[PDB]
Amino acid sequence: KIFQNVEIKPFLIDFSNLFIKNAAKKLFQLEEQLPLVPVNVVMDFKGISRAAVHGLSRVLQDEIPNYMLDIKPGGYKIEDSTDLFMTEQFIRNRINFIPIYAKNETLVFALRSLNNSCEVKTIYSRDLIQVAGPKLKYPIFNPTFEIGFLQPGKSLIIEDIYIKKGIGRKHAAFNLAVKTHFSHLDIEQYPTDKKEYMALSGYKQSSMTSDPRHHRLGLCFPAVPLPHINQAVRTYLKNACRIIIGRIQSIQKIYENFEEPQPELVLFSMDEEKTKAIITIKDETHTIGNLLKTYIYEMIPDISFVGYQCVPHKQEMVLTIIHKASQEDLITLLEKSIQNIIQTFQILEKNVDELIA
């Protein structure tokens, strides 16, 4: 039971405050909770390396597929948008970063704002009319966003607002989870309020020596429907697992083809019966490399060398493994480590399904 003791708490508006109550009620006629609210999820992991937990966190942050709202080329109608201040760049930057919880990539919206008044009129996100796709039985974004504002006698017409899929690493608009907590529960901590310890991190063991295996990770999701929170968060967690497994399985297709000359795997036979394996994979991050290094190191305690160098200006991860075995034995150990990673994340899948009811 690797993953236990998860707790989920939404972020809700306190209507006991008179100022917030009056402002919301006179702006949006809002008297109860919004359709989509942020959710903070705190998770406890036991008997698992911090490499795996941090990789799961990274994937949930900016390596999981996610949906945003984007404007197709030519959507911003210059013929009708007479406003001089709401430029295409500003408005599309506003639209891209609205957190959405979409069901399909078919929905297409439109924003048609006309200002017949003598005062600046604020364009909110409730003015996004769905023009294509099946009719929504539940909103996919909050209606309280401020898309823009129009000067008197101006207009803003935007068509072909569609749902675009991508990973958060390439563009920040696909980021999913925001970090709220990360700690190790199996390492003692100093009281850092004292002036003797305020210059230190707090943990009683140095990171150069410690190997924690009992962690607490808390992440916040920006947009989750109220009546299905446990259905959404669970899905997210499960999604992350598959992604990692998928990426790991890619490396599992490299080691299987070590007999044929493969560009992403290079094998040398060094002196003193030593063998060397270099795995160069493009567009990989520290997640996969760190997981590979940690699990190879666990599998081979007396390994000669292992490193996962991810280079920023080369956009690639190079894993170097030097070990005193033959090529076949090294490949067998690598496959065993990959299988260990796969089974660990399968157990994470099972625990996620078991915990969140």
Partner 1 sequence: FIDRGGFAGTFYREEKVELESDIESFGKPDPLITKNLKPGANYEKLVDGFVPVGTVVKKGDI
Partner 2 sequence: MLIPVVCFTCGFPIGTYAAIFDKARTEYIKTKMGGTLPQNIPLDASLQIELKDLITALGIPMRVCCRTHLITTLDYRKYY
The option from partner 1, partner 2, none interacting with 104 (CB < 5 to 8 A, set by class) reads none
257, interface contact from partner 2, partner 1, none, CB < 5-8 Å by kind: none
Identify which of residues 84 and 208 has a Cβ nearer to partner 2 in the complex.
84
171 binds, among partner 1, partner 2, none (CB under 5 to 8 A by kind): partner 1
**Does position 171 bind partner 1 by CB under 8 A?**
yes
Which single residue is written with the structure tokens 């160098």? 309
Least separation, in Å, of the C-beta of 36 and partner 2? 8
Q: Which residue has the tokens 């899905």?
A: 235
Q: Residue 49 or 175: which CB sits closer to partner 1?
A: 175
- Which residues of the chain form beta strands (DSSP E)? 3-10, 36-46, 65-71, 108-114, 121-124, 128-132, 146-150, 155-167, 178-184, 214-225, 265-269, 275-282, 305-307, 310-311, 316-323
Q: Helix H segments across the chain?
A: 18-27, 50-62, 88-96, 229-255, 286-299, 327-355
Residue 89 interaction partner, one of partner 1, partner 2, none, beta carbon < 5-8 Å per kind = partner 1
In this structure, the dihedral spanned by the alpha carbons of residues 311, 315, 321 and 327, taken in order and rounded to 10 degrees, is -160
Q: Does 142 bind partner 2 (CB under 8 A)?
A: yes
When CB distances are held under 5 to 8 angstroms depending on the partner's kind, the choice from partner 2, partner 1, none that residue 120 binds is: partner 2
Pair 115, 88: CB distance under 8 Å: no
Of 222, 344, 185, 320, the closest CA to residue 266 belongs to 320
Q: Token digits for 190?
A: 């100093």
| C-beta closer to partner 2: residue 40 or 304 | 40
Residues in Cβ contact with 209 at an 8 Å cutoff, skipping those fewer than 6 apart: none
17 sits near partner 2 (criterion: CB under 8 A):
yes
- Cβ(293)–Cβ(313) under 8 Å? no
Instruction: Give yes or no for a contact between 291 and 341, defined as CB atoms under 8 angstroms apart.
Output: yes
Tell me: does residue 26 bind partner 2 (CB under 8 A). Answer: yes
Instruction: Mark 38-77 with x for binding to partner 2 (rule: CB under 8 A) and - for no binding.
Output: x-x-------------------------------------
Could you give the count of Cα atoms lying within 13 Å of 331 in the half-sphere of its Cβ?
Answer: 15
145 in contact with partner 2 (CB under 8 A)? yes
Residue 14 touches which of partner 1, partner 2, none (CB < 5 to 8 A by kind)? partner 2
Interaction residues for partner 1, span 78-97 (CB under 8 A): 78, 87, 89, 93, 97
User: Helix 229-255 to helix 50-62 angle, to the nearest 10 degrees?
Assistant: 110
Question: Taking CB under 8 A as the criterion, which residues in 34-73 touch partner 1?
Answer: none
The contacts of residue 19 (CB under 8 Å, 6+ apart) are none
Q: Which is nearer to partner 2, 22 or 250 (CB)?
A: 22
Q: Please report, as residue ranges, which positions from 77 to 106 form the binding site for partner 2 (by CB under 8 A).
A: 85, 90, 94, 97-99
Task: Output the CA angle 295-301-303, nearest 5 degrees.
Answer: 90
Residue 171 or 213: which CB sits closer to partner 2? Answer: 171
Which CB, 19 or 104, lies closer to partner 2? 19
How far is Cα 206 from Cα 279, in angstroms, rounded to an integer? 31
Contact (CB, 8 A) for 254 and 267: no
CB-nearer residue toward partner 1: 158 or 348: 158
Q: Which does 78 bind (CB under 5 to 8 A by kind): partner 1, partner 2, none?
A: partner 1
Q: Determine, following the binding rule CB under 8 A, whether residue 122 of this chain makes contact with partner 2.
A: yes
Residue 79 vs residues 122, 157, 292: alpha-carbon distances, Å: 21, 9, 55
Rule CB under 8 A: which residues touch partner 1? 78, 87, 89, 93, 97, 171-173
Rule CB under 8 A: which residues touch partner 2? 11-14, 16-17, 19-20, 22-24, 26-28, 34, 37-38, 40, 85, 90, 94, 97-99, 120, 122, 124, 142, 144-146, 148-149, 172, 175, 178-180, 220, 222-223
